[PDB]
Paper text:
FANCM is involved in eukaryotic DNA-damage recognition and activates the Fanconi anemia (FA) pathway through complex formation. MHF is one of the FANCM-associating components and contains a histone-fold DNA-binding domain. The FANCM-associated histone-fold protein (MHF) 1/2 complex (also known as CENP-S/CENP-X) associates with the conserved region of FANCM immediately after the helicase domain to form a FANCM–MHF complex. MHF stabilizes FANCM and promotes its DNA-binding activity.
The purified tripartite complex was crystallized under various conditions and three different crystals were obtained from similar crystallization conditions. Unexpectedly, structure determination revealed that one of the crystals contained the FANCM–MHF complex but that the other two contained the MHF complex without FANCM. The tetrahedral and rod-shaped crystals contained only MHF. Owing to its high resolution, 169 residues and 249 solvent molecules were placed. The root-mean-square displacement (r.m.s.d.) of the heterodimer region was 0.5–0.6 Å. How FANCM dissociates from MHF was further investigated and it was found that the presence of 2-methyl-2,4-pentanediol (MPD) and an oxidative environment may have promoted its release. However, under these conditions MHF retained its complexed form.
Residue numbers in the entry:
A (entry chain C), C (entry chain C): 7 to 80
B (entry chain B), D (entry chain B): 7 to 101
């Protein structure tokens, strides 16, 4: 889902040390981790909307699933 | 300035990918994600990438390294057996 | 709040490696961290009960504050 | 057996400390914590100690160490500037 070059730029936005770099393996794995995170957010919010008998997923559904999502990803 | 525009471009890239990934979930589950919902998931993902980035930097430094490696990424997934197994699968696939 | 010997026994209950030990500094700091965690849980649940006009703090108040508490402690 | 009784004794010790700490908060805020609430906070704390213990073990190992030190505890607090400052204060106090 995510390109390695995008992941590198995203991570470099937040590093506090100028020495910090990220190798290619780690960029690929981070792209995979971010993809799983997005897919989980979407799938969980969709299941919450379905449980509330709605076909359209709203911000309220994301908000309901967000705390456990963040807890599951540390 | 340049950093503000960079942040905008990176948020836009995350948003594009988020919409693509959400569309796949939508077709599988028979739901639709509104534009507001896609934007919310994208912003949550952009913010979560900051937590990941700061952790990776500190994890590598804890091991006296300036370069983040697969070992640091695996440490991000340590609390979920299934996530660690998935990340380890993807790592083991690499040449 | 917590004794170092109790903290050591608590942590040793969960170590997966038989080599794992914990030095005295770390036991003291973990006792302090656990004390902060309990105090935060109690204070947050108390403030939630107060916001709901109750003087008695109930499990529902703990449950309401728990997700952000866990997120704040990683 | 022995491990089950150990777990009971450790849960009891955590519960005793939790009630003492809750009583102090209660007197300050003018609330009371029911027995059920104290037991719930204690069980949450017992479970959170497992997450801390498993993290500390992995953090020390990430640095090639079998002994957990203050550096590993500081890494637990890394995401909260205020918690890290507090833990660092307590660490700096030690002889």
């Amino acid at each position: 889902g995510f390109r390695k070059e995008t992941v590198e730029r995203l991570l470099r936005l937040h590093f506090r040390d100028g020495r910090t770099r990220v190798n290619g393996d780690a960029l690929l794995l981070m792209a995979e981790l971010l993809k799983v995170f997005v897919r989980e957010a979407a799938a969980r919010a969709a299941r919450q909307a379905q449980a509330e008998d709605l076909e359209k997923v709203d911000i309220e559904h994301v908000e309901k699933v967000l705390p456990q999502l963040l807890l599951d990803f540390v | 300035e340049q950093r503000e525009l960079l942040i905008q471009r990176l948020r836009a890239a995350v948003h594009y990918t988020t919409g693509a990934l959400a569309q796949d979930v939508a077709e599988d589950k028979g739901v639709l994600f509104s534009k507001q919902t896609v934007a919310a998931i994208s912003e949550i993902t952009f913010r979560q990438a900051e937590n990941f980035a700061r952790d990776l930097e500190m994890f590598a430094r804890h091991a006296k390294r300036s370069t983040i490696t697969s070992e640091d990424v695996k440490l991000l997934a340590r609390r979920s057996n299934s996530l660690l197994k998935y990340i380890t699968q993807k790592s083991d696939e690499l040449a």
